[PDB]
């Protein structure tokens with residue numbers, strides 16, 4: 001648990017359109033919708049041996065390579081599989097929400113995911129009032145920035161991650177100017193299928 | 195830790211600093227953790243001392259709740275939230291002074307750390323969210339979104355609250371009043387910058 005430097009893969013995912021959709025239901029319905037979604041995301045992370053760092057509203061943060069050790073290649077394979085499984089889950093959820101009148105009659109929820117691999121100080125951070133296991137550093141900052149920079153319903157990863165992805169699966173490449181980073185970052189949108 | 199999601203009038207506080215990453219690039223692993231913990235310690239102590247609830251940390255950002263899980267009058271929620279925000283800002287200045295003396299800031303031109311805080315009071319669904327596999331206690335809804343947006347809209351080293359919060363603050367303690375259009379918000383919001391001092 002004690003914080004230490006380690007090569008890990010960070011995954012950030014978020015949905016946009018949840019608030020708008022929930023705007024019609026009462027508290028109970030809002031909670032049911034969100035729990036439905038968070039449960040699916042958690043399942044996608046656990047099934048691929050990932051660590052659920054935390055939820056941030058309707059955003060999710062997962063780690064691969066901590067606390068349990070994991071090779072860099074397996075971290076990426078698992079992180080990618082999680083992102084693709086999350087998209088499938090959202091496709092299922094959206095189908096249910098549309099047949100429910102929550103979407104279509106309010107557009108379908110959209111998904112964005114960013115994945116980066118790099119060094120990060122990982123372990124328990126906080127105080128006596130509150131301590132949580134997480135990852136800190138530019139690598140984490142970058143993964144979050146990728147998630148916010150990618151287009152609707154897509155997965156964006158860094159070059160460090162893409163090097164383990166079959167070439168034919170990289171749909172689009174583009175250098176992006178990310179906040180706090182001087183050197184433009186080569187990003188790769190990967191095929192959400194396989 | 196057992197609370198099922200329920201609607202409730204609460205006060206949400208979001209605070210965040212800028213300059214940690216920059217300041218920490220000039221240090222090493224163990225130093226990062228100790229530096230982050232030093233700051234987080236000051237922040238949580240400010241929340242705890244004011245009987246607030248620390249919801250979570252989001253990197254170096256802090257989220258605190260007043261009125262949940264334990265009940266709290268709407269006026270006490272604001273008093274404690276306001277006192278919390280002010281104490282955090284004072285602690286940050288104390289921290290910057292120490293970091294300055296240690297050469298962590300004001301050297302290799304790493305500006306001193308900047309603090310921002312947003313506070314809003316309104317209805318929110320509070321309780322455990324997630325699934326049997328993983329769930330955490332937090333607050334959800336437009337009211338929470340607004341508090342987050344107020345913190346990101348206010349200027350460096352300042353505290354910004356909504357009209358719902360201001361109504362409990364002595365008028366002379368309100369530095370500035372202005373309408374700002376927050377994201378996803380149809381009706382512009384009345385923002386009030388509070389004096390960092392009582």
Ligand SMILES: Nc1ncnc2c1ncn2[C@@H]1O[C@H](COP(=O)(O)CP(=O)(O)OP(=O)(O)O)[C@@H](O)[C@H]1O
Pocket residue numbers: 014015016017018019020055056057058257332333334335338339340342343377
């Ligand atoms: N429970 C929670 N804990 C921490 N932050 C929360 C939160 N609920 C909401 N927020 C914060 O409130 C802000 C919401 O603004 P946005 O991210 O722009 C909403 P959106 O992604 O555009 O659509 P959405 O509301 O359907 O998800 C974010 O900064 C988010 O992290």
Ligand SMILES: Nc1ncnc2c1ncn2[C@@H]1O[C@H](COP(=O)(O)CP(=O)(O)OP(=O)(O)O)[C@@H](O)[C@H]1O
Pocket residue numbers: 061134135136137140141142144145179210211212213214215216251252253254
């Ligand atoms: N441990 C963590 N958990 C969740 N999100 C994290 C995180 N560490 C970093 N992030 C995310 O990474 C992004 C960092 O970008 P910014 O918020 O713009 C940093 P900043 O506030 O400008 O300066 P700073 O790095 O000194 O804090 C945010 O979206 C933040 O929420």
Ligand SMILES: [Sr+2]
Pocket residue numbers: 014015016017058059
């Ligand atoms: Sr979102």
Ligand SMILES: [Sr+2]
Pocket residue numbers: 210211212253254255
């Ligand atoms: Sr910050």
